[PDB]
């Protein structure tokens, strides 16, 4: 509901995509078994501290536009209640129900 | 040696071994004192740089991995 939880969340998502995309084999180099006495060291954790403040692991793919805690749906940009409000009003393409 | 309530010559002096193996042993020794210790700690992260025994495939100096292979 608060603007501070929306403000944290919005900045994390544009910089998670900026910073981690170009640091996706760094993950392999410093954790996964891809190294075997090769690097495994401080010099690449010099770089993984950037995707940290803003990274997928702190971006719960939610509250980047709406002020509803949990039940978010990243595919609409919305949540439980606002998906239902927009269906009621026909503001979504193809929205019907299953009858089979 | 007593005779008025003890048998003469015993047959409870048998074998030159009495070594235990099919039962309990080394609980505080087995000839002379032992007492062991255990040190393990969570994983073998005891150093700033490890080797891997499940993956031994060579390090690429790349920046893309799953998104690198399209």
Coordinates of N, CA and C in Angstrom, one line a residue, chain B residues 32-68:
Chain B
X32 N 45.2 -49.9 25.5 CA 45.7 -48.7 26.2 C 44.9 -47.5 25.6
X33 N 44.8 -46.4 26.4 CA 43.7 -45.5 26.3 C 43.6 -44.8 24.9
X34 N 42.4 -44.9 24.3 CA 42.3 -43.9 23.2 C 41.0 -42.9 23.5
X35 N 41.0 -41.8 22.8 CA 39.8 -40.9 22.7 C 40.0 -39.9 21.5
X36 N 39.2 -40.1 20.4 CA 39.2 -39.6 19.1 C 38.4 -38.2 19.1
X37 N 38.5 -37.4 18.1 CA 37.7 -36.2 17.9 C 37.3 -36.1 16.4
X38 N 36.2 -35.3 16.2 CA 35.6 -35.0 14.9 C 35.5 -33.5 14.5
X39 N 36.1 -33.2 13.4 CA 36.1 -31.8 12.9 C 35.6 -31.9 11.4
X40 N 34.6 -31.2 10.9 CA 33.9 -31.4 9.6 C 33.6 -29.9 9.1
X41 N 32.9 -29.1 9.9 CA 32.2 -27.8 9.6 C 31.4 -27.9 8.3
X42 N 30.3 -27.1 8.2 CA 29.5 -27.0 7.0 C 30.3 -26.8 5.7
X43 N 30.2 -27.7 4.7 CA 30.9 -27.9 3.5 C 32.4 -28.0 3.8
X44 N 33.3 -27.9 2.7 CA 34.7 -27.6 2.7 C 34.9 -26.2 2.0
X45 N 34.4 -25.2 2.7 CA 34.6 -23.8 2.3 C 35.7 -23.2 3.2
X46 N 36.6 -24.1 3.6 CA 37.7 -23.7 4.5 C 38.7 -22.8 3.8
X47 N 38.5 -22.2 2.6 CA 39.5 -21.4 1.9 C 38.8 -20.6 0.9
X48 N 39.4 -19.5 0.6 CA 39.0 -18.4 -0.4 C 39.0 -18.9 -1.9
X49 N 39.6 -20.1 -2.1 CA 39.5 -20.7 -3.4 C 39.4 -22.2 -3.4
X50 N 38.3 -22.8 -3.9 CA 38.2 -24.3 -3.9 C 38.4 -25.1 -5.3
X51 N 38.5 -26.4 -5.1 CA 38.3 -27.2 -6.3 C 36.9 -27.9 -6.1
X52 N 36.4 -28.3 -7.3 CA 35.2 -29.0 -7.5 C 35.4 -30.4 -7.9
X53 N 34.7 -31.4 -7.3 CA 34.8 -32.9 -7.6 C 33.6 -33.4 -8.3
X54 N 32.5 -32.6 -8.5 CA 31.3 -32.9 -9.3 C 31.3 -32.2 -10.7
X55 N 32.0 -31.2 -10.9 CA 32.1 -30.4 -12.1 C 33.6 -30.1 -12.2
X56 N 34.2 -30.5 -13.3 CA 35.6 -30.2 -13.6 C 36.0 -29.6 -15.0
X57 N 34.9 -29.1 -15.6 CA 34.8 -28.4 -16.9 C 35.3 -27.0 -16.7
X58 N 36.1 -26.5 -17.7 CA 37.1 -25.3 -17.6 C 36.3 -24.0 -17.7
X59 N 36.8 -22.9 -17.0 CA 36.2 -21.6 -16.7 C 36.3 -20.8 -18.0
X60 N 35.1 -20.3 -18.5 CA 35.1 -19.3 -19.5 C 35.0 -17.9 -18.9
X61 N 35.7 -17.0 -19.5 CA 35.9 -15.6 -19.1 C 34.8 -14.8 -19.7
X62 N 33.7 -15.4 -20.1 CA 32.4 -14.8 -20.6 C 31.6 -14.2 -19.4
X63 N 30.5 -13.5 -19.8 CA 29.6 -12.7 -19.1 C 28.2 -13.1 -19.4
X64 N 27.9 -14.2 -20.2 CA 26.7 -14.7 -20.6 C 26.7 -16.2 -20.7
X65 N 25.6 -16.9 -20.3 CA 25.6 -18.2 -20.0 C 24.4 -19.1 -20.6
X66 N 23.3 -19.0 -19.9 CA 21.9 -19.4 -20.4 C 21.5 -18.4 -21.5
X67 N 21.6 -17.1 -21.3 CA 21.3 -16.0 -22.4 C 22.4 -16.0 -23.4
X68 N 23.6 -16.5 -23.1 CA 24.7 -16.6 -24.1 C 24.5 -17.6 -25.2

